[PDB]
Amino acid sequence: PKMKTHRGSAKRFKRTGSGKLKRRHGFTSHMFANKSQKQKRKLRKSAMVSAGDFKRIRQMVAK
Amino acid sequence: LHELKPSEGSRKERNRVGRGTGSGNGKTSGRGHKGQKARSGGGVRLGFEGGQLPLFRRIPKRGFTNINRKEFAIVNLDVLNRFEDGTEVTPELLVETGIIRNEKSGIKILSNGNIEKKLTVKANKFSAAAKEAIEAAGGKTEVI
Amino acid sequence: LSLLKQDGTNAGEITLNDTVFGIEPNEKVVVDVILSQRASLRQGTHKVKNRSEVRGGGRKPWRQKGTGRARQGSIRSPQWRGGGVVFGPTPRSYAYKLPKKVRRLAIKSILSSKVNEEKLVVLEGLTFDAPKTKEFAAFLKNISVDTKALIVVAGESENVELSARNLQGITVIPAESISVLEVAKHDKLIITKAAVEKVEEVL
Amino acid sequence: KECVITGRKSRSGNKRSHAMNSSKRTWKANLQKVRILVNGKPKKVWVSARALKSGKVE
RNA sequence: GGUUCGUGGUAGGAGAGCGUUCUAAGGGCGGUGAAGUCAGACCGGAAGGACUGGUGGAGCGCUUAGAAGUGAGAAUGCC
RNA sequence: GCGGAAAAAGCGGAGCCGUAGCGAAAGCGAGUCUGAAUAGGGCGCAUAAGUAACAGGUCGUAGACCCGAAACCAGGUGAUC
RNA sequence: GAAAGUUAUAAAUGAAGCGGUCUGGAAAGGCCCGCCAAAGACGGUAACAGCCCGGUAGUUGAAAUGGCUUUCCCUCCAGAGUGGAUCCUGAGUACGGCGGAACACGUGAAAUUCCGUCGGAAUCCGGGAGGACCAUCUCCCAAGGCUAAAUACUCCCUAGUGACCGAUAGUGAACCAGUACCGUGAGGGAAAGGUGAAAAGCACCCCGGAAGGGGAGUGAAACAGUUCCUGAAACCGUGUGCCU
Ligand SMILES: [Mg+2]
Ligand SMILES: [Mg+2]
Ligand SMILES: [Mg+2]
Ligand SMILES: [Mg+2]
Ligand SMILES: [Mg+2]
Ligand SMILES: [Mg+2]
Ligand SMILES: [Mg+2]
Ligand SMILES: [Mg+2]
Ligand SMILES: [Mg+2]
Ligand SMILES: [Mg+2]
Ligand SMILES: [Mg+2]
Ligand SMILES: [Mg+2]
Ligand SMILES: [Mg+2]
Ligand SMILES: [Mg+2]
Ligand SMILES: [Mg+2]
Ligand SMILES: [Mg+2]
Ligand SMILES: [Mg+2]
Ligand SMILES: [Mg+2]
Ligand SMILES: [Mg+2]
Ligand SMILES: [Mg+2]
Ligand SMILES: [Mg+2]
Ligand SMILES: [Mg+2]
Ligand SMILES: [Mg+2]
Ligand SMILES: [Mg+2]
Ligand SMILES: [Mg+2]
Ligand SMILES: [Mg+2]
Ligand SMILES: [Mg+2]
Ligand SMILES: [Mg+2]
Ligand SMILES: [Mg+2]
Ligand SMILES: [Mg+2]
Ligand SMILES: [Mg+2]
Ligand SMILES: [Mg+2]
Ligand SMILES: [Mg+2]
Ligand SMILES: [Mg+2]
Ligand SMILES: [Mg+2]
Ligand SMILES: [Mg+2]
């Protein structure tokens, strides 16, 4: 039977042109009084999935 | 049929484990010694990190899918040079020529490369640049 | 190449189309297609009973501990005399096709290879008034075939199949059915002019 | 034990906790023993309260 | 085709191979004795392969390719 | 799927992957998003190659390399002890 | 209900080598000659047969029973248009609340479908749906029923096929096997194929109570002797070249 896409990952990652996965930052809901404005600007942007993590999870989101 | 030689490199001999120590894949058959990964059907599920919260659960869900999303079929200019000067270019013409096979939502023209022939192109949408490049040559764009 | 009549006399010469019988043979493609066609002939009707399918088992033959015997879970465990087989054959298909263009290159190449080896004979026509194997054997001696030979006809020719049904090396096919494996299985390829047109119409 | 008119009877389903534990239960019809004429002859039969509503005669 | 530096090895990666059963094609052996089995002081770097003789009494190699129930000394394994 | 010999072809272009990406999305498009910005930066483009089939390696779903519990549940059989 | 046709259920006919030599127990094998083939399928026959046998291709065939297909008999049968005054068009129904379930959809914003319980329409100016809901538009007319085919499976039958097994395999079961045996019972559940081409299955003699043997004889072989193709290893012996 077809491999099943991991649906949690599909709601959180995006595939780029080159085939990398784009993601968002964690600490981006409440407890914002704690973080600095600089910290917030950075967290607000997107990130790429790390090499090691990609190796771990690439089959989960093939398709 | 008595001297078939398949293409060199096209076929290899499969590796059989657990057939003696000479092969180098005897006994433990490549699995090493003990633990979960040595067991039959053993192996943690795909993205499992042994109890560390998996990456996908450390990072938030984002966005939604638009029910009414419109993806267009793209036709960069360079491929319109395939047509003979004076010709008007409709969708159905781009089907017959086999430049687009499926026309999702419609045909959009984009400005990648450069056009040479005075066409009278009609597509569902146009890149500002594509419209400024068809006319630049000496052609009329109309939207359908 | 040369066109000869059923009797064996020279009838003229025919020009085979040089996109079908004239291309440089691709032996690698032919081998691939021959393997696929041999693999597709397979029936794959073979099964063994694993430990679930073998009659009985069910109960533990003796208690896990205390008896001084090896622990056992079923008299049908695979190390037991009449036990289930561990993997072994399961009914499956072996069939597979290469892409259409490869399968065409293959038939064109094997044909060109018959022409490169003077193994293709072209008859003006090939007809028998009634089914008569003696007449068919006489025909093959006139052509000087002697070996295994595939005969390719296409209508007009009638009573040929029956005439040659009881000869051991010789196989007769309409021009529509000309397959790589059938040509590979036969030293000489005897084809009527009428057939040649039919084969060129497809390739 | 079923309504003789409508066929209503016990059917099964789930009880559910606030926590969504499920355990099997039944829904019984609201059957009432009443004297009606089945085939002309009046006798005591189970009838659902729903069937007795308005129509039907005891 | 030669110079130079190498060639201990567990888990393990990589490579090239031996042998088993079956299929195809080709080419063979065999009642003047097949397979099997026994014996031997032969051959190959290994897996292994021959040859000769006994037993046996009817099937079996080889080549190229293909396919696998394909190789056991250990499981307090099963018979 | 049709036709056919459990053939071979032929027919079958529905669909699939690729040829464009960026954006949650509207959308714009060799750009795009962010942004007041003609700024910077992200991902892309400039620095084209895929696809079909087979074969090897590994992974996933299946018992998934083989053997082995104690237990659990369901339907029965037992008070000749 | 008939009739005709066809298929099934028994069958019939069916070409060509006693060919010559070699080996052999025996020839279907070797060598050398022929022949038939719409028949060179398979099997058997003293070793491997298209021409020896049963057959095979092809061609014929059915008193009887059943199946199928036509045709006849037999039975059964009203259809268009024009007008919407009036009438009818599925009620404890549809829907709703509450509790559940099914829907890929876990009560969710939850349409749609069903169950129990209670409440409960409109009913042609009428009604339902389009994923809460309202309006518009579009499509539809529930609460009555029937309906072949394409699909699923195989205890069976007929004909076949297999880069499926070949007696620890393949069915548990090639063999009088769900037997023997075990169990109060439900239930569990084996082992076990091969003389030879043909019984020609060892007359007769000898030792022995017999078993068993040695001769004689049969056979190609009996070291093929009624559990009798081959007959490995463990294991058990006898003899003796070297050592102790
Ligand atoms: Mg927030
Ligand atoms: Mg290897
Ligand atoms: Mg390896
Ligand atoms: Mg190693
Ligand atoms: Mg070992
Ligand atoms: Mg270990
Ligand atoms: Mg350890
Ligand atoms: Mg490990
Ligand atoms: Mg924790
Ligand atoms: Mg959210
Ligand atoms: Mg079982
Ligand atoms: Mg002990
Ligand atoms: Mg078995
Ligand atoms: Mg060294
Ligand atoms: Mg080394
Ligand atoms: Mg053998
Ligand atoms: Mg094995
Ligand atoms: Mg052992
Ligand atoms: Mg419990
Ligand atoms: Mg009782
Ligand atoms: Mg008592
Ligand atoms: Mg005869
Ligand atoms: Mg003789
Ligand atoms: Mg013999
Ligand atoms: Mg025989
Ligand atoms: Mg509704
Ligand atoms: Mg509800
Ligand atoms: Mg549900
Ligand atoms: Mg609604
Ligand atoms: Mg209700
Ligand atoms: Mg809506
Ligand atoms: Mg929806
Ligand atoms: Mg209605
Ligand atoms: Mg058995
Ligand atoms: Mg045996
Ligand atoms: Mg014996």
Chain B residues close to C27, C-beta within 8 Å: 5
Specify whether the CB–CB gap between C189 and C150 falls below 8 A.
Answer: yes
Q: Which residues does a chain break follow in chain D (C to N more than 2.5 Å)?
A: none
Distance C173 CA to G36 C1' (A): 25
The last residues before gaps in chain A (C-N over 2.5 Å) are none
H-type helices in B11-127, by residue range? 55-58, 91-96
Experimental method: cryo-EM
Per domain, the residue ranges of chain D are 1-58
Question: Which of B56, B57, B61, B62 should be substituted to probe chain A, the one whose Cβ sees the most A Cβ atoms within 10 Å?
Answer: B56
Domain that holds residue A48: 1-63
CB contact under 8 A, B4 and C31: yes
Contact between B42 and B36 (Cβ < 8 Å): yes
Structure-block tokens of residue D54: 């308005």
CA distance B49 to chain C (A): 32
Residues 6+ apart with CB under 8 A from C182: C150, C171, C173
Residues 15-54 of B with CB under 8 A from A: 46-47, 49
Taking CA atoms, D7 is separated from B74, C158, D44, D57, in Å, by 63, 74, 16, 17
Whether C185 and chain B come into contact, CB under 8 Å, resolves to yes
How far are the Cα atoms of B7, C41, C106, C171 from residue C35, in angstroms, in the given order? Answer: 12, 10, 12, 21
Give the closest residue to D58 by CA, choosing from D30, D35, D32, D33: D35
* CA atoms of C124 and C158, how far apart (whole Å): 14
Residue to substitute from B44, B46, B53, interface A, most A β-carbons within 10 A: B46
- Contact predicate B108/B88, CB 8 Å: no
Nearest CA distance, B3 vs chain C (angstrom) = 10
Question: Could you give the number of structural domains in chain A?
Answer: 1
Residues C4 and B125: their CA atoms lie apart, in Å, by 65
Chains B and C touch, contact meaning at least 3 pairs of CB atoms under 8 angstroms apart: yes
What is the helix, strand, coil percentage profile of chain A, to 5? 35, 15, 50
- What is the experimental resolution, given in Å to one decimal place? 2.3
Which residues, 6+ apart, have CB-to-CB distance to D53 below 8 Å? Answer: none
Ordered alpha helix ranges (H), chain C = 27-40, 100-116, 133-143, 160-163, 180-184, 193-202
CA atoms lying within 13 Å on the CB side of residue C7: 3
CA distances from C24 to C1, C106, C108, C184, C203 (A): 17, 11, 9, 17, 15
Are the C-beta atoms of residues C107 and C23 closer than 8 Å to each other? no
Closest residue, chain B, to A49 (C-alpha): B55
**CATH number for position B113:** 3.100.10.10
Q: Token pair of B43, please?
A: 């192996």
Distance in Å, CA C70 to ligand 5 centroid:
20
φ, ψ of residue C150 in degrees (nearest 5): -90, 125
Tokens 């395939």, residue located: B82
Nucleotides in E strand less than 7 A from protein CB: 11-17, 24-26, 63-71, 75-79
Collect all residues of chain A within an 8 Å Cβ-Cβ radius of residue B47.
6, 9, 56-57, 60
DSSP tag of B52: B
Give the amino acid at D14: N
Cβ separation of A12 and B61 shorter than 8 Å?
Answer: yes
Collapsing DSSP to helix, strand or coil, C120 comes out as strand
**CA–CA separation, D32 vs D11, rounded Å?**
17
Q: How many CB pairs under 8 A join A and B?
A: 40
Distance of alpha carbon C67 from alpha carbon C16, whole angstroms = 83
Token pair recorded at residue B16 = 């059989």
Task: Give the CA-to-C1' distance from C38 to E57 in angstroms.
Answer: 38
User: How is chain D split among helix, strand and coil, in percent rounded to 5?
Assistant: 5, 50, 45
- The dihedral region occupied by D37, where left means phi > 0, alpha psi between -120 and 50, and beta the remainder, is beta
**Extended strands (E) in chain C:** 2-4, 10-13, 120-123, 149-153, 171-174, 188-192
